[PDB]
From a paper:
Titin is a protein expressed in the skeletal and cardiac, or striated, muscle of vertebrates that plays various roles in muscle structure and function. Fn3 domains have a characteristic beta sandwich fold, with a core of hydrophobic residues as the “filling” between two beta sheets that pack against each other face-to-face.
Here, we present the crystal structures of seven human WT titin domains – Fn3-3, Fn3-11, Fn3-20, Fn3-49, Fn3-56, Fn3-85 and Fn3-90 – and two domains harbouring rare missense variants found in patients with HCM: Fn3-3 Arg15908His and Fn3-56 Ser23226Gly. In addition to the WT domains, the structures of Fn3-3 Arg15908His and Fn3-56 Ser23226Gly were determined to a resolution of 2.10 and 1.43 Å, respectively. There is usually a positively charged residue at the Arg15908 domain position, and the Ser23226 position is also highly conserved. Both the Arg15908His variant in Fn3-3, and Ser23226Gly variant in Fn3-56, however, result in the loss of polar contacts, and this is reflected in the loss of thermal stability of the domains. The melting temperatures, Tm, are shown in Table 2; briefly, the WT domains had Tms of between 59.8 and 74.3 °C and the variant domains had Tms between 46.8 and 66.9 °C, with a reduction in thermal stability ranging from 7.4 °C for Fn3-3 Arg15908His to 13.0 °C for Fn3-90 Arg27839Gln.
Numbering used by the authors:
A (entry chain D), E (entry chain A), F (entry chain C): 3 to 103
B (entry chain E): 4 to 104
C (entry chain F): 3 to 102
D (entry chain B): 2 to 103
The structure:
Amino acid sequence: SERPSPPVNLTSSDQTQSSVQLKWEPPLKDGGSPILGYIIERCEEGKDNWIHCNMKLVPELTYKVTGLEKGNKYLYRVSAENKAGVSDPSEILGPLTADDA
Amino acid sequence: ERPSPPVNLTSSDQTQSSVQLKWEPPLKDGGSPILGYIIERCEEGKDNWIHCNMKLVPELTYKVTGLEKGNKYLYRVSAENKAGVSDPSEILGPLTADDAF
Amino acid sequence: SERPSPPVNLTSSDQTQSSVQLKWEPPLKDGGSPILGYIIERCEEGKDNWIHCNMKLVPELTYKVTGLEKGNKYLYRVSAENKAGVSDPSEILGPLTADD
Amino acid sequence: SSERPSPPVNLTSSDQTQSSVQLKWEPPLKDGGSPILGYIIERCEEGKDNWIHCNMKLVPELTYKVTGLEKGNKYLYRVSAENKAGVSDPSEILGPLTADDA
Amino acid sequence: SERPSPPVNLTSSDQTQSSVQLKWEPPLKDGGSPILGYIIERCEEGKDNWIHCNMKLVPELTYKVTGLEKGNKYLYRVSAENKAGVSDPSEILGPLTADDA
Amino acid sequence: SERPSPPVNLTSSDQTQSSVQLKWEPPLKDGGSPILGYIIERCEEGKDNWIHCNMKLVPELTYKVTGLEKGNKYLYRVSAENKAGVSDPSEILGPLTADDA
């Protein structure tokens, strides 16, 4: 009937100089319609614009962000989409630095 | 004394007739170990909370069954020790009883 | 360039009369440098002092606390460290009773 | 261009009576790029599964007195924010709160 | 019917060497019965036991703690009571040092 | 003996085309020393840099941000300082648009 609530508990792992593994939990409210997938966005320091990380909807609760530039800091957020619309983005993750560890 | 509520109640494997719930233990056990958990659900179109499990669930997960296809459900979980039962966790849902994804 | 933010969602499992397994998620902000490891602290009821549990940094997101006294209640908190410094401790977990 | 704002936060109550309650909240942390025009207050009674609009016109303030409560009943409350782009998700739910004198 | 939920958003102001002004918001859930009042407790560092500050229930949403010792650090928590019982305490405030601004 | 915790519940009111009134609550933990004051920072969209708004520490729990440009979006955060050091900034407030209500 309506858009779902935001995904919750966005977290990270496997941070490298060029990628990072994001993980989250599903919305607490689906808005009355099943979740079709998720939209991952990232924002780099030095730019005020949020970029889409996945082209097609991600049906998983995890996603590997790629294309990171070494030494840069990045913010991350993830939204959920159903037939009714797209949720507000989760709470922002980051700044996380693109370094090997 | 009674423990604090369970935290971070989440879901997975939503079907037309069931859903897998998962949570984390209380941050405070009130001075006595947790004996188990009490799972409750509430359907839309009805104002009463129903007990899902008969005996206490000692695990941190539980499969709710007996859902009606297409209906929306709320969920909450409490923790019990020798002293009493905690307040319920944060409410999960509305979640629609449909085969997800 | 600066200290990271606290670890988040500190939780517990596998509580025994002498040990407990702690688990957490990494800081939301690393302060510009990778996380080197974590510092686990505990505080017993009947004492107002926080104690370090691990000597060397824990690079993992989990750690088994040992040496607990039967029947006692304990508080727990974990911090993250990078080359710049140590974060504020996470939200306090506990009191958790040391019983099987 | 713009988008809906984030939900109002910290919805709380005061002056609970047999027939009314004073609701209070804080503005969204994100306005979506356009000023907040006002707020939409909703309530849900126990014994009914439907959310009801309490105010007809938008409330521009950060407070609003809900009236028409039935003595002894329990009520849930939530508030949303609206700008030119749309209406936010409702805040976290307040209640059940019983309409009774101390 | 049942005990209320904990008071929320416990905060402070007007910290002195002998007192502090506490303020909070009412429970999100009253358990089906009005809140009769609140119970303020404090715990000093160097002592492991929580002490009751007020004898009679406080019907207001604020209360001035007195009798603090200069230089000492204190923890604070507040509970709500209705005809059914007393809630879990709010989130703990402090350590706050008993010193003049 | 150590820095305080971040200020909490940073909120806004009286948004205009050139100013906004910020308000917050004191740290939950003062680190064992009184709070000397607060440091207010803002960041404009289209720029990745946080700017200090106040020169001298603000002892109050509120502050009027000025110098905003009409139509621009701004982020805000506030830190607390004692004799031991400066806290991590509070949770970020914004984006909030500089426009007359």
